[PDB]
Amino acid sequence: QLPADTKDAKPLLKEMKRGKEFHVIFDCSHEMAAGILKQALAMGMMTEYYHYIFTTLDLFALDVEPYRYSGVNMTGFRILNTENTQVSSIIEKWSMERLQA
Amino acid sequence: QLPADTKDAKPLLKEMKRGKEFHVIFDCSHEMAAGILKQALAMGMMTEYYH
Ligand SMILES: *[C@@H]1O[C@H](CO)[C@@H](O)[C@H](O)[C@H]1NC(C)=O
Secondary structure, eight states, rough: OSSSSSSSGGGHHHHHHHHHHHHHEEEEEEHHHHHHHHHHHHHHHSSSSSSEEEOTTTTGGGGTTTTGGOOOOOEEEOOSSSSSSHHHHHHHHHHHHHHTO | OOOOSTHHHHHEEEEEEEHHOOOOOOOOOOOOHHHHHHHHHHTTTOSSSSO
């Protein structure tokens, strides 16, 4: 169980590294998934050995640029049917007004 | 040999990782050491193996 604060996730990661646990099913809102993945990266917990699975339904929204060359596997799930072009147009129109925030 | 530009470092590091070479003596001004270290981190070559 990840503790109350996120950035205190380091002890868990140390324990997992010592125990040689090479498969994980994270479970949290993608916002906290990003933090735990960054903590993993700075822990050297990110190579072609480990393989993460994210029960979050927004794994696609993460920034993946710093991670994709590492050779790590991150299988997620995505319900938002973005293959249809109509959906893509709607999403783009939505982004056209999200950037006020 | 490192290539001319900094971020060209990646193809070199790919072959390093493929050949299973965990002992490296770098030789460059630290201004390049920082860049090559970031590349090595994004390439995921920063574990307890490499020295
Ligand atoms: C991890 O990803 C790489 C590239 O897709 C793949 O070749 C490998 O089979 C995957 N599994 C492991 C070893 O984690």
